[PDB]
Every structure is written in C-alpha cells, then in structure tokens.
Design a protein around this ligand. Structure first.
Ligand SMILES: *[C@@H]1O[C@H](CO)[C@@H](O)[C@H](O)[C@H]1NC(C)=O
Ligand SMILES: *[C@@H]1O[C@H](CO)[C@@H](O)[C@H](O)[C@H]1NC(C)=O
Ligand SMILES: *[C@@H]1O[C@H](CO)[C@@H](O)[C@H](O)[C@H]1NC(C)=O
Ligand SMILES: *[C@@H]1O[C@H](CO)[C@@H](O)[C@H](O)[C@H]1NC(C)=O
Lengths: 48, 106, 85, 126, 48
C-alpha cells in the first residue's frame, strides 16, 4: 500500500552548480575539439 | 457537463439519493467531490474523495461512484438537512473543473 | 497470469497509471492450496498479455528474489597485490 | 484555517474587477487555490486556479480570455483580475483551498480534506 | 502422458513405425496456462 498521497520519485540538482560544472566541462572539451567550435548536450538517443 | 436531478423529495427514515452523470473524461477517470450549501452561506464539502468524508461531517451522508455516474446517499432526511447539493470533478476534455447544476432538496 | 487495474485510477498526478493493482493465485505452504494475492507493481515491471498482464521478465529469464536482510549499500573494497607484485 | 475574501462592490460595465483573498494558518505555498462564483439563485462556476509554489495557472475556457489569476506568497494573498465585466456575468465570488501541490509535480492537484476550508464570499454587482 | 500415433503410418519402408507422432500438454511461460505440443519421437525413446 501507499500511505498518504502517491508521489513521483525524483532527484534535486542545483541549477547553478550544474551549469558551472558543464561550463568547466565545455572548456576542457574545447581544449580537444577547438576553441571556436560549438558544444551541445542532448538527451540519450535510445536503447534500454 | 455532470448532470444532476432538477430537485429531490425525501422523508425522515427513508434514504434520499442525488445522482450525477458525466462521461469517462470527467467522472469515470477522476474523483467526484460532494458539496452542500444553504442560501446565503458559502458551500462546505461533504465528501472530498469519491468515498472519503472529513472528520467534521456526520455519518448520515455517504456516496459511491460507478462507471461514469456517481450517487450521494442521505440515510434519512432531517429538517435541518434540506439544502442545495452540488458535485464537482475535473473534466479532461474541457480541461477545467466542472460543476453540476445541482439539486434542491425539500 | 495477473489480473490488474490501475492503482489510484482517479488520481491526478504524473503517476497516473504508473502503479498497477494486480491479483493472482500463486500458491502457498501446502501444494494442494492456493492463496489469492493482491499486490502493487510499477508499470515498468508489468507488460500486457481487469486486464491480463504478466511480469516483464517471464518472457526472458528466471527471477530470483534478493534477500531482504542483505544491504545493497556500496562498501569500500581495496585491491591488494599478492607477494611478488 | 481561515480565509477572508475582499473586493469591490459595484463595478461599472467594462471596468476592471479585482478581488483578493487572504488566509491564516494554511501555508500558501503548499496548496492549489481557486476561485469559484455563483449568481444568487444559480449554480456554481469554476474560474481558475494557482499552483501555490510555481505560479502556474489554469482557467475555465469559457472565461479565459477575460480572466487573469495571480498570487503573492508574501502576505499569503491570492488575487483575481476580471475585465470586460457585465451584469450578465456578475456573481457572489468565493475563494477556497482546492488541493495539495508538491514541488516535484506541477500538475498534482492532490485531493485533501483541507479543501473544505471555504470562505464566506463577497457579492459583486455590475 | 503422451498420446501417440505412428508417423507416416501408410509408408512402405524399413522405417514403418520407427517415428511416432506424439501429442502432450506440457506447459509454458506462465504457470497458469499449457501449450499443446505435437512432436516426433523415435520408437526407441518412447515406451507404451
Ligand atoms: C540537499 O540537501 C541539503 C541539506 O541541507 C540542502 O542544503 C541542499 O540544497 C539540497 N540540494 C538541493 C539541490 O536542493
Ligand atoms: C485463480 O484461480 C481460480 C481457479 O478457479 C480462477 O477462477 C481465478 O480467476 C484465478 N484468479 C486469478 C487472478 O488468476
Ligand atoms: C520478449 O523476449 C524477446 C526476446 O528477443 C524480446 O525481443 C521481446 O521484446 C520481449 N517482450 C517484451 C514485451 O519485452
Ligand atoms: C491435455 O489436457 C487436457 C485437460 O483438459 C486434456 O483434456 C487433454 O486430453 C490433454 N491432452 C494430452 C495429449 O495429454
């Protein structure tokens, strides 16, 4: 049984910390892929 | 969209029922709340889920839902119980909460 | 074969249909009797086949229940070389 | 929990009608709040609601183009702004607690006993 | 228990009765259902 209301499982990630984390990752990726390229992040395309 | 009886008779000692009839998009898939009001006073709810009542409501009122219809049962008409009754539910076709037109109990 | 309906079918939420209330016969301590069971399963564990459903894995493999007394919390493991390495 | 409605009495045709509701012991951010109205002698019509956390709104499609609902967590206040008002569309206006809202689900509308906490309403004329 | 008839019962050959066409209930993926099966077995694997 579920006591109380049925609530969705979820994760809390601070937006500012994550944004800074990706900015750092992008800088390090640019070091290998070129300073003038555009780096894009996207959701997983498929599979299990 | 949820229809209700135009009015409704009753007597002490006999059950009195009020019906609502909707569709699969408003009653069949959503909880139906029941409300009771007197003229000049704001409504209060009697039933907040299709079956569950607040702790402040007496045992004379109960309700059930089946299919696309629902019914409120009063176990016996008291002189203090006559009132205007309403049912409410969320209508996913309209995408709004919908009231029935209500019934007047005498 | 499971006979299932949605859990909290009238609930407004993101979890609308995510939990199914399934009924099945299973069995019990004595081989001659069966105990009807009502249980809740997540949508992702139950696949259609009251509606009839089966567990998602019955088409692929045997299911072993993990012991409820053994924790899944990661514990640090150290790797040590044998003498000579 | 208490709720006190307040607003204009007679509003001339085509003027803006603006009502505010204040609550006491119910944390504003934990519930969905809505507006409901009824003319005397007539049934009730739902106007719209607010997600006490996100500020998200819902409106009755028959009213939507003329109705804006807003909230302010500070001072625990809920407001309704209606334009192009006519006598045909006036009513007694009420606020009520509608449902429980959770931060993880902006469409929750979770049923609760607390929805019984209705105010007494005000009569608006046009 | 298998219910069997001879395979190719009208065949003239040395293999006359060597293969039997057997029917049985067995079972299937779900414990509540059974799948009737028709299969061929050699005489030496099946005993009356
Ligand atoms: C996780 O919990 C801590 C507890 O203090 C809280 O400060 C932090 O903000 C939480 N994380 C997020 C993303 O809210
Ligand atoms: C359990 O077994 C009985 C056997 O008579 C059957 O009638 C019933 O429908 C079964 N229920 C389920 C959920 O499989
Ligand atoms: C059943 O197993 C097969 C094995 O290849 C798989 O392809 C199929 O998707 C499975 N069924 C479901 C519902 O996952
Ligand atoms: C299979 O089981 C059914 C059960 O009703 C029975 O009638 C049938 O004769 C069985 N067939 C074989 C080949 O055992």
């Amino acid at each position: 049984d579920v006591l109380g209301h049925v609530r969705m499982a979820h994760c809390n990630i601070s937006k500012a910390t994550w944004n800074e984390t990706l900015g750092k990752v992008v800088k390090q990726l640019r070091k290998h892929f070129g300073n003038n390229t555009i780096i894009r992040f996207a959701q997983s395309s498929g599979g299990d | 969209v949820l229809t209700q009886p135009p009015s409704v008779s009753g007597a002490p000692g006999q059950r009195v029922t009020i019906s609502c009839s909707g569709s699969s998009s408003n009653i069949g898939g959503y909880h139906v709340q029941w409300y009771q009001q007197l003229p000049g006073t704001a409504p209060k709810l009697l039933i907040y889920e299709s079956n569950k009542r607040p702790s402040g409501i007496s045992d004379r009122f109960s309700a059930s839902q089946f299919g696309t219809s629902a019914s409120l049962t009063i176990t016996g008409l008291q002189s203090e119980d006559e009132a205007d009754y309403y049912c409410q539910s969320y209508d996913s076709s309209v995408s709004a909460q919908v009231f029935g037109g209500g019934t007047r109990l005498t | 074969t499971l006979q299932c309906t949605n859990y909290a079918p009238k609930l407004r939420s993101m979890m609308r249909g995510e939990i199914k209330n399934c009924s099945f016969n299973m069995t019990t301590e004595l081989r001659d009797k069966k105990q009807k069971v009502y249980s809740l399963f997540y949508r992702l564990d139950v696949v259609q086949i009251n509606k009839e459903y089966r567990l998602i894995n019955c088409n692929t493999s045997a299911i072993t229940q993990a012991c409820p007394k053994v924790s899944f919390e990661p514990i640090p493991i150290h790797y040590c070389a044998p003498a000579g390495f | 929990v208490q709720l006190q409605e307040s607003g204009p009495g007679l509003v001339k045709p085509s003027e803006t009608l603006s009502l505010t509701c204040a609550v006491s012991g119910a944390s504003f951010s934990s519930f969905w709040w809505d507006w409901i109205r009824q003319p005397p002698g007539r049934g009730l019509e739902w106007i719209g609601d607010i997600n006490g956390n996100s500020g998200s709104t819902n409106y009755n499609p028959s009213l939507k183009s003329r109705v804006t609902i807003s909230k302010d967590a500070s001072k625990s206040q809920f407001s309704l702004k209606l334009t192009s008002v006519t006598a045909a569309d006036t009513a007694v206006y009420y606020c009520a607690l509608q449902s429980v809202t959770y931060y993880e689900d902006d469409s929750g509308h979770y049923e609760t006993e607390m929805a019984k906490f209705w105010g007494q309403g005000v009569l608006v004329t046009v």
